Structures are given as C-alpha cells and as structure tokens.
Amino acid sequence: GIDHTSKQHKRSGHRTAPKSDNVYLKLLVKLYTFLARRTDAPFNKVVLKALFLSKINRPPVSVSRIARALKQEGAANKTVVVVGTVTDDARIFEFPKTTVAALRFTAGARAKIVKAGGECITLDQLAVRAPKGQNTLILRGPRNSREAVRHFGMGPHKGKAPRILSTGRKFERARGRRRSKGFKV
Amino acid sequence: GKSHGYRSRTRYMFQRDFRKHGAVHLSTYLKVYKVGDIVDIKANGSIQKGMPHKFYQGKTGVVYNVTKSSVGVIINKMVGNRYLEKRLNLRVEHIKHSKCRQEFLERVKANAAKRAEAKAQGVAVQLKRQPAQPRESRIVSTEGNVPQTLAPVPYETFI
Amino acid sequence: AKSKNHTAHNQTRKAHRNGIKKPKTYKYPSLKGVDPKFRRNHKHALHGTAKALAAAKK
Amino acid sequence: MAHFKEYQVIGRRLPTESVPEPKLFRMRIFASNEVIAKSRYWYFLQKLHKVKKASGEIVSINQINEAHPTKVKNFGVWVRYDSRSGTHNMYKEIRDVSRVAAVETLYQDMAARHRARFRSIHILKVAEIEKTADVKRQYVKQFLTKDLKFPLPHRVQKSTKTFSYKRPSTFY
Amino acid sequence: IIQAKRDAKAAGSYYVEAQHKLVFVVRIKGINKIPPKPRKVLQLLRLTRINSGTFVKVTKATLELLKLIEPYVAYGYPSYSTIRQLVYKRGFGKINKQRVPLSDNAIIEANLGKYGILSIDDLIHEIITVGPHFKQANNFLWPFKLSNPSGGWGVPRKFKHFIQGGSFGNREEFINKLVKSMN
RNA sequence: GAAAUUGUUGAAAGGGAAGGGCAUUUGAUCAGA
RNA sequence: GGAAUACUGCCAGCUGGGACUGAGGACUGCGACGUAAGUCAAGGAUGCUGGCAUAAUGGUUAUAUGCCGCCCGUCUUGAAACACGGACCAAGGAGUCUAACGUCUAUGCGAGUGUUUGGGUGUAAAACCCAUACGCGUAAUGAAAGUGAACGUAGGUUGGGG
RNA sequence: AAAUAUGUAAGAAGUCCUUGUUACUUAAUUGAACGUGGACAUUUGAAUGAAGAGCUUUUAGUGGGCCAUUUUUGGUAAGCAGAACUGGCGAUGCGGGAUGAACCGAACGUAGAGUUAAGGUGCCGGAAUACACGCUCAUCAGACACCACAAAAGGUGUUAGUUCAUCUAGACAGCCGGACGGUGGCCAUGGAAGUCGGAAUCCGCUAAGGAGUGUGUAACAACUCACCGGCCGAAUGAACUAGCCCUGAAAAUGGAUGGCGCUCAAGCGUGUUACCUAUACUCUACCGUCAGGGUUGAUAUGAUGCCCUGACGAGUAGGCAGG
RNA sequence: GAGAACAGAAAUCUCCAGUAGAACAAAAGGGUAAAAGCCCCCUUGAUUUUGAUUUUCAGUGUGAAUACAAACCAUGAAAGU
RNA sequence: GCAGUCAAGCGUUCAUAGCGACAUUGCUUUUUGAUUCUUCGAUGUCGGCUCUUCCUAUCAUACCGAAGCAGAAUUCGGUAA
RNA sequence: GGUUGCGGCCAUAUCUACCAGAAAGCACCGUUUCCCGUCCGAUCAACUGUAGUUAAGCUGGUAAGAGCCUGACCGAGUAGUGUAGUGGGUGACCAUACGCGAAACUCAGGUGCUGCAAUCU
Ligand SMILES: [K+]
Ligand SMILES: [Mg+2]
Ligand SMILES: [Mg+2]
Ligand SMILES: [Mg+2]
Ligand SMILES: [Mg+2]
Ligand SMILES: [Mg+2]
Ligand SMILES: [Mg+2]
Ligand SMILES: [Mg+2]
Ligand SMILES: [Mg+2]
Ligand SMILES: [Mg+2]
Ligand SMILES: [Mg+2]
Ligand SMILES: [Mg+2]
Ligand SMILES: [Mg+2]
Ligand SMILES: [Mg+2]
Ligand SMILES: [Mg+2]
Ligand SMILES: [Mg+2]
Ligand SMILES: [Mg+2]
Ligand SMILES: [Mg+2]
Ligand SMILES: [Mg+2]
Ligand SMILES: [Mg+2]
Ligand SMILES: [Mg+2]
Ligand SMILES: [Mg+2]
Ligand SMILES: [Mg+2]
Ligand SMILES: [Mg+2]
Ligand SMILES: [Mg+2]
Ligand SMILES: [Mg+2]
Ligand SMILES: [Mg+2]
Ligand SMILES: [Mg+2]
Ligand SMILES: [Mg+2]
Ligand SMILES: [Mg+2]
Ligand SMILES: [Mg+2]
Ligand SMILES: [Mg+2]
Ligand SMILES: [Mg+2]
Ligand SMILES: [Mg+2]
Ligand SMILES: [Mg+2]
Ligand SMILES: [Mg+2]
Ligand SMILES: [Mg+2]
Ligand SMILES: [Mg+2]
Ligand SMILES: [Mg+2]
Ligand SMILES: [Mg+2]
Ligand SMILES: [Mg+2]
Ligand SMILES: [Mg+2]
Ligand SMILES: [Mg+2]
C-alpha cells in the first residue's frame, strides 16, 4: 500500500488533439506538432495548443480588433495570427494593410483585408513563411463575452443574469429584486 | 430551548482582567492605525459599542478603513472548506497593534544593514534565519566538578 | 421514531478532500467599506494625478 | 529487559551564562544497551533533580565491566518495586559472578515471585557482601558451608531420537 | 574524534561528542489508521510507504517532526557504510519527476552539477556531511525502498518504542544494523 | 425441432446434501510441431 | 606490567553450496584489463550435450487427494440468516418518444443567422432552387411616461502567454 | 493557570531616498491615499514537501448510519440513549483474533523468488516437546488485549519481603513445681469472697504471682491461666506486605483455553535466540492506466502509428471511457 | 460603627469607615464610581436619505446590532456625545 | 429473588447454637422494569390438561457435622437432584 | 534634588501607625460689593495675597508592618496533559516510553519609574 498524496491515474485535463474530425484541421495539427517538437519556438507550441480548442474557446477576432492590435507601438508590420475565425466589422472605417493568418475568414473580413491591400493566409502558409513564428502577433477573441457566461455564478448579490425565457415586467422582478416586495436579492 | 445570542458563551471572554477594571487608559486612544496596519482583536468588555463578535477574539487582521472612532479590519474566516473575507467595524478599544511583524521589520532593517556592510567589506551575507542546530562538541572538565553518584530513593509515605 | 440530531463527523474530511483554500489575495483590494469621504477625495486625487502625468509626458 | 550491561552515565543539566560547569551528576544503570541506559538515567534524574533531557545533556556513557568476572560473590540488592496495590522496598541476596548477572537474576526472580515487570522495579543498590555471616538469607547461606557437596538425583538425558530401545535410566 | 576522547580522558575531562547532524528515518508502519498530523508529517518526509526511508538533517524543526511520527518510524544516526550501501544499491534520483537509478556518474553530474556534485561519492559525501546543498541532494535522492529486515526485527512486536523492547523511535546507532538488514 | 422434465445404453463417483476455487495423481480425449 | 580474547563496528577482503529469474534483440553508452592490437563478468544468456518426435510435455474433461468455499437478489448500520422473492425451463419483460429548455461538444455561416408556412421544380413524401416576412441576435434601462451607451490612441494601475 | 487545539507574520504586491495629485485632513506641503523617479537577485530574507498551480462550468448519488481509543452528558446499567476529535465499517477483500462488519496487521492488476507484519512453533497445523531463571497441585487448576465476567472477605497451602521483638545471663514449644500474704480491697446486691457489675489497678514477701485469664459455687470451696521456676539446648515469636493456588463460587439439552490433551507444562511472570507465513515490503516478468518524452528524412501501407522512460492499480451508490 | 426630645430594634438629623459587598425595568451573565448608579437642567439622535458591515448563514431572508457618508437637530463652555 | 463479609446488639450470663443493626461485596434471570437488536409479504397471542427432560438456591428419603442436641420433637449446616 | 501645571505606565504607586520637611511652590487660610450657587459663601462663585500657619493637605522616611511587584536547580519536573503498546489490574484505576509542563507553598529581593513645561536657598 502507498499513502497517495494525489489522485492516481489523473488525466492531464488538457486536450492533446482536437475533438473535431476535420481532416484539414488534423493535418494542421500534425504540421504544428512537428514544428512544436522540432523548433523550440514557444509560438509553435501555443499555436498547437490553440488548434485543439473548442468553439467557445476560439471566439471570433474582428478586423477592428486586428486593427487595434496593429495600432500597438511597433506592431504595425507584424503578421496577425488568429487560431479561429476572423469576422468583419463595419464599425471601423479605416483598415490598415497587413498579413493575417487564420483558420477561417468570413467573406466580409477577407474582402475588407484584401481591399485594404493585405493578404489572408492559412496557418500552414504562416508556418512556411515564419516557421518559428517570427514577427507574429497572436490575437484571441473575448471569451467572457458569451451569452452563457453572464449566467455563470448566479446567486444572491452576484448580479449574474438569471436564466430566464421571457423578459419584462412580471418576469422575476418583484420579490427578491426590490425592497418594496420583501427584500432585494 | 437552545440559545445562541450575539454574546453567548462570552462570560469569561469579555471580563475585565481582574484588578484592571474601569476606565480605558489614554494610550489606547492615542494609538494611530493606518490602512494596512496589522491589528490583534481583543474585545474590551467595558466598551459595549463597536465590539467584535466572540469569533474574532484573538484573531489578527489588516486595517482597510479608518473612521472617527473605529477601524475596519479584514479577517479571513474559515467557513466550510474555504476562507471568506469579513470586514469588521471595530472601535479602537477592541484592537491593538500586532507585534507579529515588529520582529520581521527589525529583521528587514538588520538584513539591509548587513547586506550593505557585506558588499562593503567582502562577500558573505547569510541573511536567512536557521533553526536551532545540534550542539557542537565540547569538553567538560571535572576540576571542582567531580561527578556525584546518585541512586534511586527507597519508597516511603511521609504522610 | 427518533433519529440522530447532529454530528460534525466526517465534515473535516469532506472539507479537506478539496482542501481549505486561502482566499486568493489580490493587490489593489476592493474599497467597498472605505470611508466615502476618503473615496470621494481619492477619486479627485487620482484624476488630478492622471491628468498631471498625461500633461507631463512630453 | 534483556541480558544486562552496567553503564556509568554522567549528565550535565546544560550550562547557561549564569551557571557554567554544572554539577555533573552520575548514575550506575543496568540496561541492555546505551539508548535504554540513557533513557533510564534521564528517568531517574527527573525523579531526583529539576532537569529533563531537553534542559540537560549526556556528558558521558561508559560500560563498567566486572572487576573480577570469574570470582564467585554474594550480592545484596536493595530494590523498590510497584505491586498491584502499593510500592514496597525489598532486600534480596543473589550469588553470582558479576553485577550484571546478579541483576538479571534479580529481574527474573522479581518477575517470577512478585509479577514485577522491568518498568515496575527500581534498583536502589547492588553491593558485594565482603564478609560471610553478613549474608542474612538462608537460601544463600546454605551455599557457604565448608566443603559443600550435593548430588543431582534423577538425571534426565535428552533424547536425540523419537524412539529409544533401552528404557533409559536416571542414575547420576 | 577518537583522539579527542582519549585526550579528554587523559586530562580528566569528558569529551562530549557533537550532536548528530544527520538521521535516517524508515517508516515501519503501514498506511492504514494514521492520524492526520502524523500522516501529513510522514508525507512531508516522503515516507508514504512501509519500509521507505529518507535522510533528514537534524534541526529543531525536523526533530519536532520526528517526535510527531515516532510511533510509525524507526530512525537513527546512519554510518558512512550504511549511507554508501544505501546510495550504491538503492540510489535513485528524481529526474523530471521520474525515478531514475544512479547507475552512472553522468546522471548525478547532469542533475546536481550546479551544486558541485559530480559523482555518486560526491552525493554520499554531501549526505553524510550535511553540506550547503544537503537539501537539494537529499530531495534529488528518491526515497529509499527497503525490503523487510533479513534477520527479522529482533523483537516480538514492532509497535512499541525501541526503549520498551520494540522497533519504533530513536535507536540511534542500531539504525545501521536495521537498515543494513533491510537493504 | 431448444430447454425444463424422462427412458435406455455407455462412462464415472457416492459413510448424514450436492455444487465450487488453487494444485497435482489417475482414466478418457485432443490440438499444435 | 605486557598481552590475548570477548563484544560492537568497518573492509571498494577472499571464497563454497542452494533457489528463482534470462526481460531486451544489428551498433551507439559508461567502464575495466591490455602499451597497442584487441579482450571482458562493462546499457538484460549464452555455450556444450542427451533422450523423445508422441499423447511424452501440454490443453480439456471426469474422478481422487490437501486446504479453502454458507444462497443468490433486495431493503438495511448490520443477511447465510429463524427477513422478504425465487420448484424448474422456454419466450416476452421495464429511463422511451415528444414540446420547451441549461451546460458541454461537433458542424455551417457569421453581425448576422434559420431553404423545407409557402412557391418553383422533380427521376415525385426524396433531391434541387426561391421572394417577402417572421423568430432570435446586433441595446439597455425604468412600474411607466420616457430616455438611451468614446474626455481619453474605447482610459489608468498591476499581473499576463506570445 | 497548563497540555492539546487555535489567529497572524517570516518580503520585490518588500524596504529605503526624493517629491507630484486631491474638492479629504492639518494652524501650516501638515498628514492620508494613490502616484513619477532612483537603489538593493548567489541565502529574494526559517524547515520539510510539492504525479505543479490557479480557474470555470455542469451533473450523479447521498441527505436512516454504525463501531473502536480518547474527552464527555442522561441513566443503576445496557450490545441503552446523546455529543467532541480521529481512525474505521458501510463501500473491504487478504494474514491473525477458532468462529465475528468495526479489533490487530496490512489494504488488493496477473505471476515468480526472497523477507516479514499481527499472530504463532506438543498434535490437529506450517514452525524449537528450544534455551534460561523462578512460581503453581486446584475432589470446579490455568492458559493471551477487544472478548465473551467475577467481588468484598478469608487460608501455618506455598513463595518472596517489611517492621518490631525474645535468645547460651538459656529464647519458642513441650513436660513437671509454685501461682502467695494485707485481702471477703471499696460499693448496690437477697447473696457477689479475683472471675454479674460501677469505680479503684495499691502494698508486702518476693525467683514469681492480675485486687485476677477462664472453668466452677447461691456464696464459698475446688481446678486453670497470666508471672516465676525445674528439664532440654539454638534459634524463635508477632503484626503486616503481595505473588501463585484454594474457600468465597448456585441454573436449567451434553460441551467447550477452538479440540485433543498438557502438571520441573503444552500453565503463570520474565529474558534470549531460532523458525513458520499475508493479496504487506524488495527485485524481476507480463497486462492495463496515467504522466513525461523521441520519431514524417524516404522503401515507413497502421503519426489517434511505432518506440523510450517513470510511477501507479481496493471499491457499494454513482460518473465517465473503450469495447 | 459612633452620636440627637418625643423617636424605641425601623422614621429625621450628623460624622466616620466603606472596590461597590448597591443600583442600573425584567431572566442570567458581563460592564460601570468625579459613572453606565442617585438628583437636577435642557431636550427629542426613538428624526431624514439610501448604501456598507457583524451574528444566525446558503455567507439567502428576518430580527438584532456595528461603523461611516449626506442633512436637520439636541445638549454642553467645549472637546465631544 | 438469593447469598456473603464486618460485628453494635438479641439470645437471662455469651457476638457468631440460632440470629443480627449501622454499612458494605456479590450472584441469578423463575419478578417487574429499562432498551428497541431480531420478527409487521404473519414465530398462533392466557390458563389448564398430557408428557419428557434438565437445574439446585433440598420439602421428603440416604449418610453425616453442629445446637440454647437429656429423650422425643425440632433448628442450622455438608455430601447429595 | 524639592515643588507646581499637564501627564504616560496605573499599588514597587495602595492601606495602617508614627516621625520629619530649609527654600520656593502647593496648601490650609482672610472677606462677601460684584458674576454665581446653596437650608447654610460648608461645597461652588467672586475678592484680597492682605490678617496667620506648616496644624492638616502634600512630600519623604520609618515598620522582622498588611498588601502589591520581581526572581528562584523553593516546592516540582510534582499535579495535569499530547502521543504509544495484543502494558499491569476483575474492576476502580495504575505503571512505563517519547514530549510539554503548572498552581499553591517556601525563600530572597524591592516599595514608584518616568515625559513636557515652569519655578526654587
Ligand atoms: K410481526
Ligand atoms: Mg498497489
Ligand atoms: Mg480573560
Ligand atoms: Mg446601544
Ligand atoms: Mg438524519
Ligand atoms: Mg530466515
Ligand atoms: Mg512479531
Ligand atoms: Mg417436426
Ligand atoms: Mg433435455
Ligand atoms: Mg444413510
Ligand atoms: Mg566480529
Ligand atoms: Mg500431464
Ligand atoms: Mg471451511
Ligand atoms: Mg433493521
Ligand atoms: Mg444478502
Ligand atoms: Mg436467527
Ligand atoms: Mg417486505
Ligand atoms: Mg417463497
Ligand atoms: Mg428473453
Ligand atoms: Mg432516506
Ligand atoms: Mg438506536
Ligand atoms: Mg447502505
Ligand atoms: Mg478494512
Ligand atoms: Mg476468540
Ligand atoms: Mg508441524
Ligand atoms: Mg484477595
Ligand atoms: Mg462468681
Ligand atoms: Mg478460582
Ligand atoms: Mg499451542
Ligand atoms: Mg514462559
Ligand atoms: Mg505478489
Ligand atoms: Mg503520451
Ligand atoms: Mg479499480
Ligand atoms: Mg456625569
Ligand atoms: Mg432573534
Ligand atoms: Mg406460520
Ligand atoms: Mg411454529
Ligand atoms: Mg447444594
Ligand atoms: Mg469661606
Ligand atoms: Mg472657590
Ligand atoms: Mg506636621
Ligand atoms: Mg510586608
Ligand atoms: Mg494501534
């Protein structure tokens, strides 16, 4: 017998391959597994880990987010890497010329980048251009902007978006939500 | 029925330290508490206002707020399987400055001075405390100290 | 039929299975219960400090 | 406890700045090894003086060998022991060739006759009785008569085999 | 040390030997029915299995741990021969959280070289003489997995104190015989 | 044309149940090389 | 006074007998001996020899022998229970589908999304194509009237992968 | 006023130096908070450890408990009823306690070898009818904790002790002799003379003899004993103490140190070795799980592939995964 | 305790001693002596606004309480409360 | 319910022939309680009749010890179911 | 060093009984028109510092003083207590092992220290 100080046979708790059966995603995973194993560049390892992420862990990165990241001092000529979908954003009226590497581009996002004079490239094209992630800028979309997230941690005095089907007057607003009916929260 | 009041079971906790009853001496009110100061909580039974709950007697916390006659103290309370942040509004008669870090601050100053004198004289610092070490070898003389032989004593009652 | 009334048996074991976790101290703690007069003046002090530091970055 | 050895144990009641060179107390302890000897020394020092192992130190432990291990001696042994209902002092006389052998015999005899375990016995004193007629116990006095001879009737020889073919004899 | 004892005796003094700086502790009790505080102390001394042993540098902080776990361990002062045989036969290093046998000096150099330990004998020296890097060397050493004693425990019952005819507690110099029979 | 249940034949065992586990003896039978 | 011996301990001292194991499968390494060739007990067994070539080993099965072995299911703190169901066998026999939903995951598109109410079409309940709407989302808040999201490089400080 | 338990601190989110903001505060650039700038990494300021840490979501079952040591309440008590801490059983097999949920030991993948735990070694039954010192004879002996009961009080049974005494100037026991005088001491009593009783405890002669140790009388008397002698000649007496044994000790079918049986034990107390064996420890092999890695440079068709390394494996309710 | 007509053993007056052996609404515990007790003077902070916090606790509610803020007041010479 | 230990007293005198206070130690499960462990998909719930066996804390019978046993009768106790 | 005003710690400072106190200070002390308060100028208020005194307050000393404070190889490693055993004991309880460790008692010492400011033979 052994007095175990930790749980035995505990899985790492992190994905080691995508849950997806996309053959092209599996090929990209293979390429970046090779790169992460035989380059020692942290960019390749983080891209390989990002390729495993689920959909809610790969929020879309808008072109406006890419432009704001490129407005960083010294990042104007860096290749923007988004392991996920790049979406369009009509709220920004001036997009700069740049190279964006992403898993997927929305038609509008690709059109905006091309019209601004840049290129939309795949992750294997990015690997060929910069095998060690030279001059790269990894961008991640807002994870906690999800609709599901605001209901997380619901409870007294949390302010955490009760799970409700219809909203308005008569829908969970009287007893426990205001001092005039019993108490507020 | 059962009885769990605010001051239940505080009969000896909140007593006045026999032959130390009456008015609180003025050093308690002349003490100065800044935000971040570490204070020990000990309720004064003669001051019924701003009194801590019995759970916080003997608890040590950090001041987060300073008011006219009271300070706010942050206490980490064990509730279930985790600690919850509690904020107590305690009058200064129920707290005192904690000496749990006076030794640490003096050690900090002494370590700074020792480090400066080390980097001025040579290369040696040894700025970490060490536990009590095993004693080294020593020679014990018998000059004027010849060993006296003892024996266990026989039983007797002497009552 | 009478039953058991109370016991703390196994409660410490349950609490220590997931452990008693210290409450994750942060720098810049919350100013929830801080004296509102101090908070009101602190807001103006920080605003003036920010404006001074912005104007002095030449 | 086991086959005994005798140790002198000298301890110090560790010096301070006010009292350097403390009084260096000594004991003769019968024990099977030095760990037990030191433990017994500290036990009796805690029974006698205001000191404990944490506030004292062992200055010296030395095995004391029998001066004449091949000379037959009469020993008088003063012991104190705890019975089931009280504490009593006893004086016994043991004939042996060494203090350690006499003490082993004493522990065996106390266990046999009074059910006194090792933990319940304090050896107050073991001293050789130099002069006969100061031996006061008949079970030792009977072994000091001039030209003492005695037979060993009914000898029982141990058989190396399960079966014997001779109907053996107990002559001697 | 021998000559200091002889000279003190010749001068009529007593040479009090320096208190031992090193102990070897072997867990002699199973993993069942251990109170939480002694169980935690055993885990922090890496005795998570019966007949597992570790070296402990003696201070007040570790002496109180030994006091807490006394009824479940046999500990004492290991000799050079005991330490050498332990490291030679059952010496394993913790390398990348793995138990790797110390079959070559290159392993010891690659894992303890930054502390000036180049060989298995350098490791043994750092253990026996409690050096500046004793903590790192001892923690690099995987807890020794000893067998049961080959001639038995020498007592009918293990779980009373060594002073009381048992096996646990401080058996100061006899730990060498116990560990050798266990190795 | 199953099983429960039954007859005959053949084999085997059987001092107040039978059945089972590990191991091998003996009898019968059999694969692989 | 000089030893010896006991006891305890040490030797990187020598050596005999017994048992179990032989995993791995070109080389790579660390060593030892040897001046060097090379050899080796040095990152896991090889060498020589004999009998058999089949029920001999072995498997299966029946029996015998040694030791062990309470009747399953269930409720229960506790079942072999003098607690309940079960004489036996075959077949049937118990978390299903739907409406609306939470989390998570996969897929398509993405500030948009949903062709399939319906229309067109068809090799005719399939497949293919489609307008206007509608639903949800892109704005919230207030009981409501109502109002409605950039001082700033959409802020400062701290940590932050890259 | 302890012990145990318990709060806090042991640094870079620190320390030190200079001075910017404020509508707060001060008599006052006084202080408070937040700052800009500058200096200090070998031990960045105790020990030990760290199959890493932190974080989030969503869901099953459960919400009758019970037992053991210790603390403890009610109750005479309970295999009762209720609390505290811990460890367990439930949910757990394995070796031991004959047998048993909880005790001891130890927790479990499939095997081999070795060593042990608790417990044992007369035979059942693997292992010394081993060694050593003693104790016990039971016409109800005794024989390993939990646990399957026994007490007060007793015993010239036997063993070992404590204390106080007597003794060659003659002890104890034993046999024989004396055991007197004042005196029927003073008092109710009907009678009371040493011996129904109250008080008084003397003196003499003494080697010695109580104003009497008992039998006895109505009272006497008569015997007897304390006390002293004669004989003998070396040890003896008393009160206690506690070991084993015995008495105390009585229930119902016939039966239980587990059985047989065991008596310088195969019982009891103690000590020393040797030996036996768990699914426990050590080493190795194989299976699987987890973790860390190597390997798309091809003939390499199995990169969820091949390979290397280390550790781990109990399980009801229940969850998930691969089949 | 010592003193004064009725007036003693209890009436009113005086002094001394008096660490609280009294009193503070109530049960008990704690607290309190130039007071928290007794007497006197003035008053309505037993007011308004909405937050924070402690106990019970799920860190929900309710009750009770704590410390502030923004007003208006009371009291005192004032600090303050 | 039954049995002990002490022994102030009863027993004309005399503790213990027979008793025995004030106390105290036990045994038994033929009383009644206490508890709720077994049984509520069911152990037939009083008493009597009949019949067998077991226990001894023995009423009688056998043999005895003791007495406030002269005999007779009786009482206490032992081996004994 | 004395004294005063304000104090800090709050008896080593308190309590009882005597003794002493130069200078200054403090104090008692003298008066009732005014402000003010009482049954009472006793308290409180005001006025004088003049008429007097160290009697008291106050300060210090004394006492095998009471109390209080400190220390102790004093009691005592005792009581108690954490951990351990298939330890003892019918039990009640007790012993032992590894640790922690009192209180009473006894003895010895001591009897305010000190800050700011002013003033004094
Ligand atoms: K029933
Ligand atoms: Mg395992
Ligand atoms: Mg207190
Ligand atoms: Mg109040
Ligand atoms: Mg319940
Ligand atoms: Mg062996
Ligand atoms: Mg054993
Ligand atoms: Mg047919
Ligand atoms: Mg059939
Ligand atoms: Mg038959
Ligand atoms: Mg030798
Ligand atoms: Mg065969
Ligand atoms: Mg069986
Ligand atoms: Mg039940
Ligand atoms: Mg069952
Ligand atoms: Mg039954
Ligand atoms: Mg049922
Ligand atoms: Mg049925
Ligand atoms: Mg079927
Ligand atoms: Mg239920
Ligand atoms: Mg119950
Ligand atoms: Mg259950
Ligand atoms: Mg178990
Ligand atoms: Mg049994
Ligand atoms: Mg045998
Ligand atoms: Mg007795
Ligand atoms: Mg007469
Ligand atoms: Mg008996
Ligand atoms: Mg036997
Ligand atoms: Mg024996
Ligand atoms: Mg095995
Ligand atoms: Mg892997
Ligand atoms: Mg499993
Ligand atoms: Mg007042
Ligand atoms: Mg309430
Ligand atoms: Mg029926
Ligand atoms: Mg029936
Ligand atoms: Mg009878
Ligand atoms: Mg006047
Ligand atoms: Mg006045
Ligand atoms: Mg005077
Ligand atoms: Mg005095
Ligand atoms: Mg145990």
Swiss-Prot record, chain B:
One of its GO terms (cellular component) is cytosol. The keyword Ribosomal protein applies. The keyword Membrane does not apply. Pfam families: Ribosomal_L21e. One of its GO terms (biological process) is cytoplasmic translation. It is found in: Cytoplasm. Keywords: Cytoplasm, Isopeptide bond, Ribonucleoprotein, Ribosomal protein, Ubl conjugation. There is a cross-link at K31 (Glycyl lysine isopeptide (Lys-Gly) (interchain with G-Cter in ubiquitin)). InterPro entries: Ribosomal_eL21, Ribosomal_eL21_CS, Ribosomal_eL21_sf, Translation_prot_SH3-like_sf. GO terms for molecular function: structural constituent of ribosome. Its main location: cytoplasm. Component of the large ribosomal subunit (LSU). Mature yeast ribosomes consist of a small (40S) and a large (60S) subunit. The 40S small subunit contains 1 molecule of ribosomal RNA (18S rRNA) and 33 different proteins (encoded by 57 genes). The large 60S subunit contains 3 rRNA molecules (25S, 5.8S and 5S rRNA) and 46 different proteins (encoded by 81 genes). Belongs to the eukaryotic ribosomal protein eL21 family. There are 2 genes for eL21 in yeast. Component of the ribosome, a large ribonucleoprotein complex responsible for the synthesis of proteins in the cell. The small ribosomal subunit (SSU) binds messenger RNAs (mRNAs) and translates the encoded message by selecting cognate aminoacyl-transfer RNA (tRNA) molecules. The large subunit (LSU) contains the ribosomal catalytic site termed the peptidyl transferase center (PTC), which catalyzes the formation of peptide bonds, thereby polymerizing the amino acids delivered by tRNAs into a polypeptide chain. The gene is RPL21A.
From Swiss-Prot, chain C:
Coiled coil: none annotated. InterPro entries: Ribosomal_eL29 (IPR002673). GO terms for biological process: cytoplasmic translation. GO terms for cellular component: cytoplasm; cytosol; cytosolic large ribosomal subunit. The keyword Ribonucleoprotein applies. Residues 1-36 are annotated as: Disordered. GO terms for molecular function: structural constituent of ribosome. Residues 1-25 have a biased composition (Basic residues). There is a cross-link at K51 (Glycyl lysine isopeptide (Lys-Gly) (interchain with G-Cter in ubiquitin)). It is found in: Cytoplasm. Its main location: cytoplasm. The keyword Ribonucleoprotein applies. Component of the large ribosomal subunit (LSU). Mature yeast ribosomes consist of a small (40S) and a large (60S) subunit. The 40S small subunit contains 1 molecule of ribosomal RNA (18S rRNA) and 33 different proteins (encoded by 57 genes). The large 60S subunit contains 3 rRNA molecules (25S, 5.8S and 5S rRNA) and 46 different proteins (encoded by 81 genes). Belongs to the eukaryotic ribosomal protein eL29 family. Component of the ribosome, a large ribonucleoprotein complex responsible for the synthesis of proteins in the cell. The small ribosomal subunit (SSU) binds messenger RNAs (mRNAs) and translates the encoded message by selecting cognate aminoacyl-transfer RNA (tRNA) molecules. The large subunit (LSU) contains the ribosomal catalytic site termed the peptidyl transferase center (PTC), which catalyzes the formation of peptide bonds, thereby polymerizing the amino acids delivered by tRNAs into a polypeptide chain. Present with 51100 molecules/cell in log phase SD medium. This is Large ribosomal subunit protein eL29. The gene is RPL29.
Curated annotation (Swiss-Prot), chain D:
Keywords: Cytoplasm, Isopeptide bond, Phosphoprotein, Ribonucleoprotein, Ribosomal protein, Ubl conjugation. SUPFAM superfamilies: RplX-like. One of its GO terms (molecular function) is structural constituent of ribosome. It is found in: Cytoplasm. Its main location: cytoplasm. GO terms for cellular component: cytosol; cytosolic large ribosomal subunit. There is a cross-link at K125, K131, K149 (Glycyl lysine isopeptide (Lys-Gly) (interchain with G-Cter in ubiquitin)). It comes from the Eukaryota. The modification Phosphoserine is found at S32. HAMAP family: Ribosomal_eL20 (MF_00273). Component of the large ribosomal subunit (LSU). Mature yeast ribosomes consist of a small (40S) and a large (60S) subunit. The 40S small subunit contains 1 molecule of ribosomal RNA (18S rRNA) and 33 different proteins (encoded by 57 genes). The large 60S subunit contains 3 rRNA molecules (25S, 5.8S and 5S rRNA) and 46 different proteins (encoded by 81 genes). eL20 forms multiple interactions with RNA and proteins in the central protuberance, connecting components of core functional centers that are located far apart. Belongs to the eukaryotic ribosomal protein eL20 family. Present with 54300 molecules/cell in log phase SD medium. There are 2 genes for eL20 in yeast. This is Large ribosomal subunit protein eL20A. It comes from Saccharomyces cerevisiae (strain ATCC 204508 / S288c). The lineage of its organism: Eukaryota, Fungi, Dikarya, Ascomycota, Saccharomycotina.
UniProtKB/Swiss-Prot annotation, chain E:
GO terms for biological process: cytoplasmic translation; maturation of LSU-rRNA; maturation of LSU-rRNA from tricistronic rRNA transcript (SSU-rRNA, 5.8S rRNA, LSU-rRNA); ribosomal large subunit biogenesis. It comes from the Eukaryota. One of its GO terms (molecular function) is RNA binding. GO terms for cellular component: cytoplasm; cytosol; cytosolic large ribosomal subunit. It is found in: Cytoplasm. Keywords: Cytoplasm, Ribonucleoprotein, Ribosomal protein. Its main location: cytoplasm. Present with 101000 molecules/cell in log phase SD medium. There are 2 genes for uL30 in yeast. Component of the ribosome, a large ribonucleoprotein complex responsible for the synthesis of proteins in the cell. The small ribosomal subunit (SSU) binds messenger RNAs (mRNAs) and translates the encoded message by selecting cognate aminoacyl-transfer RNA (tRNA) molecules. The large subunit (LSU) contains the ribosomal catalytic site termed the peptidyl transferase center (PTC), which catalyzes the formation of peptide bonds, thereby polymerizing the amino acids delivered by tRNAs into a polypeptide chain. This is Large ribosomal subunit protein uL30A. The lineage of its organism: Eukaryota, Fungi, Dikarya, Ascomycota, Saccharomycotina. The chain holds residues 62 to 244 of 244 of the full protein.
